[PDB]
């Protein structure tokens, strides 16, 4: 029977849903290694919403090549790996270490550009719903109001992307940004579906929520962010349009 893999050789390069785990063979060969058997057990997570008991599993990595790409993992989560080496006559002792998947952006609610709850010359009111954590808690919500320039083509030069750079309304004209952040909430607001009024003129976390100009065409996105380990990740979804 073979020795164990040296615990200190086990290293992992980690992603949102994958961990590439890598090690070195046991210190001296009793006999040829035929497979490594690996258990991964979900240890802990920054996500408040998932039950980890079902997230564990086993890998019988056939063959004696010393790495494996773990797949389908859950983000923001620490997995403990136990590696056993096997001579054809049986396993060596286990060695074990743990690594953590990186967090991912929260998953927004589904929107279909339903006609808003009410609309005026200066305001639009829409029903917001809480986003779900996927790897880390939702930290803040942000609301993006974006002006439409006149266009002569549908086509885009590049992929559609969200808004990581916040901008207060009063600075957009100076900075020539196409959008402004109308509001930000701590995510303890919007724990259940409740309407929100674009342009209600009140200030949320330092963002003024400027009323809209009726001769301007606008589209509004609802965005959410999650934070851990200095990585902070966002997603956004368009909730309404206005023109006049
Ligand atoms: C990892 O595995 C390789 C592959 O060996 C093959 O796969 C194993 C999982 C077992 O099923 C083995 O029974 C099987 O041979 C080992 O490397 C080298 O593989 C070659 C090809 O099979 C072996 O070749 C033979 O060796 C004999 C003796 O020298 C010659 O007379 C033959 O002509 C033939 O070429 C070779 O033995 C094998 N090398 C060694 C040192 O065993 C590899 O060693 C193994 N490593 C570990 C750490 O497990």
Numbering used by the authors: 481 to 724
Reproduce text from the manuscript describing this model.
Type IIB receptor protein tyrosine phosphatases are cell surface transmembrane proteins that engage in cell adhesion via their extracellular domains (ECDs) and cell signaling via their cytoplasmic phosphatase domains. The four human R2B RPTPs (PTPRK, PTPRM, PTPRT, and PTPRU) are type 1 transmembrane proteins and share a common extracellular domain (ECD) architecture of one MAM (meprin/A5/μ), one immunoglobulin (Ig)-like, and four fibronectin (FN) type-III domains, with the most membrane proximal FN domain undergoing furin cleavage in the secretory pathway. Previous studies have shown that PTPRK, PTPRM, and PTPRT form homodimers, but not heterodimers, in cell aggregation assays.
All six chains are essentially identical in structure (pairwise RMSDs over 220 Cα atoms range from 0.44 to 0.92 Å). This loop is anchored at one end via a disulfide bond within the FN4 domain (C642 to C716), and the sequence encompasses the furin-cleavage site of PTPRM, illustrating that this site is surface accessible within a conformationally dynamic loop, but that cleavage would not significantly destabilize the fold of the FN4 domain. In both crystal forms, one chain is missing the glycan on N598, indicating that PTPRM-FN4 not only adopts conformational differences in the furin-cleavage loop but also can undergo heterogeneous glycosylation. Although the previous structure of the PTPRM ECD had no interpretable electron density for the FN4 domain, it was present in the construct. Superposition of the FN3 domains from our structure with this previous PTPRM structure demonstrates that the FN4 domain can be accommodated without significant steric clashes with surrounding chains, and FN4 colocalizes with weak and disconnected electron density that is unmodeled in the deposited structure.
